[PDB]
Design a protein around this ligand. Sequence first.
Ligand SMILES: CCN(CC)CCO[C@H]1CC[C@@]2(C)C(=CC[C@@H]3[C@@H]2CC[C@]2(C)C(=O)CC[C@@H]32)C1
Ligand SMILES: CCN(CC)CCO[C@H]1CC[C@@]2(C)C(=CC[C@@H]3[C@@H]2CC[C@]2(C)C(=O)CC[C@@H]32)C1
Lengths: 206, 206
Amino acid sequence: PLHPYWPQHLRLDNFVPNDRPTWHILAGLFSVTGVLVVTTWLLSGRTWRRLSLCWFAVCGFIHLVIEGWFVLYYEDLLGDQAFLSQLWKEYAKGDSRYILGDNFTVCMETITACLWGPLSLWVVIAFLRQHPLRFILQLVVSVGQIYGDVLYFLTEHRDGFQHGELGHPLYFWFYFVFMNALWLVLPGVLVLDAVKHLTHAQSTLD
Amino acid sequence: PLHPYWPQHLRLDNFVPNDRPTWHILAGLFSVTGVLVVTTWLLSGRTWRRLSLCWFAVCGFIHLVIEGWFVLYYEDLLGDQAFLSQLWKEYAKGDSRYILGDNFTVCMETITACLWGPLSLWVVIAFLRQHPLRFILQLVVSVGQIYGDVLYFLTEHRDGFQHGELGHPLYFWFYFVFMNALWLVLPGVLVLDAVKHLTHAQSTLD
Ligand SMILES: CCN(CC)CCO[C@H]1CC[C@@]2(C)C(=CC[C@@H]3[C@@H]2CC[C@]2(C)C(=O)CC[C@@H]32)C1
Ligand SMILES: CCN(CC)CCO[C@H]1CC[C@@]2(C)C(=CC[C@@H]3[C@@H]2CC[C@]2(C)C(=O)CC[C@@H]32)C1
């Protein structure tokens, strides 16, 4: 095959295999995410909700930098761009169609980068002073994430999983199903959390 | 041309124009919506927030009946079905591609039928103080509606408004821009409402 993307009849000109190996991307992401998690842990310290703050920092980073990189630089598809573009080519080696610049993928991603990145960072920043809007922002960001991800799954399901090889453990099960299921489940828990707290605050008013 | 739908290269066999004229559909929906608004006003009696309740009842009605009708019967869309199917063909004469059964559109519509419809009825029920959840549900539903509508507009914009004639007063400006813009403007205002109240309720933390 000329390319690993599973709709193998795709004739992808301007396609260049990336010079940096995947372990480069893994090391870079692990290090940067560790730095963010540690720094946010310290800022929160100076119990679980501090972990949620670290989660929101990671989310803001992913939405703003990575997904923003996708929204800005499709369809470039040349590994001469940073390990962000190399990362996107690897994930597109996974199930989803991040090479074609699909209308929905670009639109959904632009919304999450422009809004949920900034709003997640606002969740963590304004959470450090226990501000009334905090549970509202946590709920809004988690609803937007759950909604975008549900549309993501629904669209690729009705498309018959055309994009990306089916059943594959790494590319389909870990990349497509698991991580996205994280953005389904974890903000779901956060939704339940924020709802319980906002309900308690609302019940007091009499 | 054999059909009025504007991607004029569309070769739509199995297309049958419905025998009922557009005034049939417009009168039917206008009357049923009047019935709903009046009955909901009476139920609220038994100021502005009562109008918001009537709005949410109308929203639940549209999401459940009309958009679920589309979600179930977006495949055949032959006017030999009730004035709902002809209603969808009439709207599809406008910009959007509700005849092709676009992969993205149905998915989005499914969500609004399955979630924002029932949740709107829960909003109107819970507003008579049956639960603190009334404002939370209002915020969740309005955020979801705004997200669906923004994705709708963005997706049709990147497509260059291919679907549906540009500039057309009735089909583009009234159907596509104006009506949908309601689900842009009104729930946005409603979000502000809940925020003002929810922030004040969260202000209770002392
Ligand atoms: C969050 C938005 N959702 C839809 C809502 C789209 C998915 O966003 C992806 C963003 C990149 C990233 C983290 C993904 C999982 C596996 C990672 C991949 C980055 C590159 C990695 C590190 C490798 O070299 C092997 C494992 C790969 C998730
Ligand atoms: C919020 C969801 N958004 C997508 C994000 C889709 C909006 O749902 C559509 C539901 C049918 C309806 C109301 C539409 C505009 C013009 C209406 C049309 C129905 C038939 C009408 C009444 C006529 O006979 C003349 C005016 C026509 C809006």
